[PDB]
Amino acid sequence: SFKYESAVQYRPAPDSYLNPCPQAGRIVKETYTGINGTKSLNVYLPYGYDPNKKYNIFYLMHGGGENENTIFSNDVKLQNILDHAIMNGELEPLIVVTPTFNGGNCTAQNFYQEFRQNVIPFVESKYSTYAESTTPQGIAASRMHRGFGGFAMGGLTTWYVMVNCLDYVAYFMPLSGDYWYGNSPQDKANSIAEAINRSGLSKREYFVFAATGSEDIAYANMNPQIEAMKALPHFDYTSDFSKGNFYFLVAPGATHWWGYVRHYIYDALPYFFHELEHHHHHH
Ligand SMILES: COC(=O)c1cc(OC)c(O)c(OC)c1
C-alpha cells in the first residue's frame, strides 16, 4: 500500500498505535562480547518471522543517558508502533535492533567500530537478513537492506556510522542530532561527500532521511548541516527515494522528547529499503 511522496509531512501515529497489538513481534534480549566487552542489545522480530525468508534490518540507537532497553521500554513503546504498522501493511516486516553505545571503551562517536566488527556479525548470523554470510563481503553485498538511525547522541552515532560504514549500510535516519566533525557546516558536508567519494557509490545507493522537531534544540545544529548537504551534488533533495536520496522532516511544535521522536520513525521507516529491493513492488 505504501507510495512515496516527494515532500512527506509529519503525521503522528494514531493514539491506538501506542497500545499493544495482538500481532506482536518478539523482542529478544541478547548478550555478546566484542571490542568493548560484554554488552547487550534487543532484537525485534516481526510477527510471523520466518528464518527461511530474508528481512530488512534497521539498527536504532538511543540518546544520552539511555540504554539498549529504552526504545522498547514503557517510556517509548516503539514496538507497539512497529507491530501496528506491520499488521496494517504500512511498513514491510523487518528486524529492528536496539544496541547501546554504553560499556567498555564505547562512545556515541566510536560505536561504529563495534557495530562493524561485533554487532552485525552477532545479530545477522543468528537472524535472517539479506546477508548470506557475515564476512565483510557478505555484509557489504547486502548493504541495500541495512539501515541505521538514532536519536540525539544516537543521531550523532548515526552520522559517524554513515561516514565510516557506507560499505555496509545504505539507509540512514539521524534524529535530532548533527554530525560533530568540523568547524563549519561545510566541513561536515565535505566530510560526508568525501566518504561518499571514497565508497565509489552512486547517488542511488545511499539515502538519508533526517528528522527533528521545530521546537527541538537539535534543530539549531542540524539545519545548517542539512543546508550545506543540499548544496552537494551527492544529494538530491526529496523524500521520493525513487527519484532522489535526501530529506529533512521537521515536525511542527515538537520538542526534544521520545514522545515525538517515535513518530518520526513511524513516518520515515516506511520509506526505507525499496530501492534495489528483491520483491516486485510498486511504490
Ligand atoms: C541533549 O542534547 C543533545 O543530545 C544534542 C545533540 C546534538 O547533536 C548530536 C545537538 O546538535 C544538540 O543541539 C542542542 C543537542
PDB file of N, CA and C and ligand atoms in Angstrom, residues 152-153 155-156 176-178 180 217-218 221-222 256, ligand 1:
ATOM      1  N   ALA A 152      19.405  11.933  19.053  1.00  0.00           N
ATOM      2  CA  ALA A 152      20.195  12.842  19.893  1.00  0.00           C
ATOM      3  C   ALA A 152      21.648  12.418  19.825  1.00  0.00           C
ATOM      4  N   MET A 153      22.285  12.007  20.923  1.00  0.00           N
ATOM      5  CA  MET A 153      23.618  11.452  20.787  1.00  0.00           C
ATOM      6  C   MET A 153      23.623  10.198  19.865  1.00  0.00           C
ATOM      7  N   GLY A 155      21.774  10.085  17.174  1.00  0.00           N
ATOM      8  CA  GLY A 155      21.835  10.742  15.892  1.00  0.00           C
ATOM      9  C   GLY A 155      23.270  11.042  15.490  1.00  0.00           C
ATOM     10  N   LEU A 156      24.055  11.555  16.444  1.00  0.00           N
ATOM     11  CA  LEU A 156      25.496  11.656  16.221  1.00  0.00           C
ATOM     12  C   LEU A 156      26.098  10.279  15.857  1.00  0.00           C
ATOM     13  N   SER A 176      17.262  14.315  15.389  1.00  0.00           N
ATOM     14  CA  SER A 176      17.609  15.290  16.424  1.00  0.00           C
ATOM     15  C   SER A 176      19.062  15.217  16.890  1.00  0.00           C
ATOM     16  N   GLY A 177      19.975  15.153  15.945  1.00  0.00           N
ATOM     17  CA  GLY A 177      21.396  15.201  16.211  1.00  0.00           C
ATOM     18  C   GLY A 177      22.113  15.533  14.934  1.00  0.00           C
ATOM     19  N   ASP A 178      23.167  16.336  15.062  1.00  0.00           N
ATOM     20  CA  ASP A 178      24.047  16.653  13.947  1.00  0.00           C
ATOM     21  C   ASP A 178      25.364  15.862  14.011  1.00  0.00           C
ATOM     22  N   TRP A 180      29.245  15.900  14.421  1.00  0.00           N
ATOM     23  CA  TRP A 180      30.181  16.831  15.101  1.00  0.00           C
ATOM     24  C   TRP A 180      31.580  17.027  14.425  1.00  0.00           C
ATOM     25  N   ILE A 217      15.712  21.412  20.379  1.00  0.00           N
ATOM     26  CA  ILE A 217      17.004  22.086  20.459  1.00  0.00           C
ATOM     27  C   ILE A 217      17.996  21.691  19.374  1.00  0.00           C
ATOM     28  N   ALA A 218      17.991  20.419  18.959  1.00  0.00           N
ATOM     29  CA  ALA A 218      18.951  19.969  17.971  1.00  0.00           C
ATOM     30  C   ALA A 218      18.781  20.561  16.594  1.00  0.00           C
ATOM     31  N   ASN A 221      21.570  22.968  15.256  1.00  0.00           N
ATOM     32  CA  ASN A 221      22.792  22.457  14.660  1.00  0.00           C
ATOM     33  C   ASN A 221      22.513  21.578  13.435  1.00  0.00           C
ATOM     34  N   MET A 222      21.361  20.887  13.392  1.00  0.00           N
ATOM     35  CA  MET A 222      21.025  20.109  12.206  1.00  0.00           C
ATOM     36  C   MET A 222      20.765  20.967  10.996  1.00  0.00           C
ATOM     37  N   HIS A 256      12.338  18.049  22.087  1.00  0.00           N
ATOM     38  CA  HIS A 256      13.372  17.006  22.201  1.00  0.00           C
ATOM     39  C   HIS A 256      12.936  15.946  23.194  1.00  0.00           C
TER      40      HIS A 256
HETATM   41  C1  LIG B   1      20.700  16.684  24.866  1.00  0.00           C
HETATM   42  O1  LIG B   1      21.145  17.318  23.670  1.00  0.00           O
HETATM   43  C2  LIG B   1      21.656  16.552  22.709  1.00  0.00           C
HETATM   44  O2  LIG B   1      21.800  15.370  22.838  1.00  0.00           O
HETATM   45  C3  LIG B   1      22.036  17.282  21.474  1.00  0.00           C
HETATM   46  C4  LIG B   1      22.693  16.610  20.445  1.00  0.00           C
HETATM   47  C5  LIG B   1      23.063  17.265  19.260  1.00  0.00           C
HETATM   48  O3  LIG B   1      23.734  16.627  18.197  1.00  0.00           O
HETATM   49  C6  LIG B   1      24.150  15.298  18.435  1.00  0.00           C
HETATM   50  C7  LIG B   1      22.755  18.624  19.117  1.00  0.00           C
HETATM   51  O4  LIG B   1      23.100  19.289  17.947  1.00  0.00           O
HETATM   52  C8  LIG B   1      22.104  19.324  20.140  1.00  0.00           C
HETATM   53  O5  LIG B   1      21.840  20.693  19.930  1.00  0.00           O
HETATM   54  C9  LIG B   1      21.385  21.415  21.055  1.00  0.00           C
HETATM   55  C10 LIG B   1      21.748  18.638  21.312  1.00  0.00           C
END
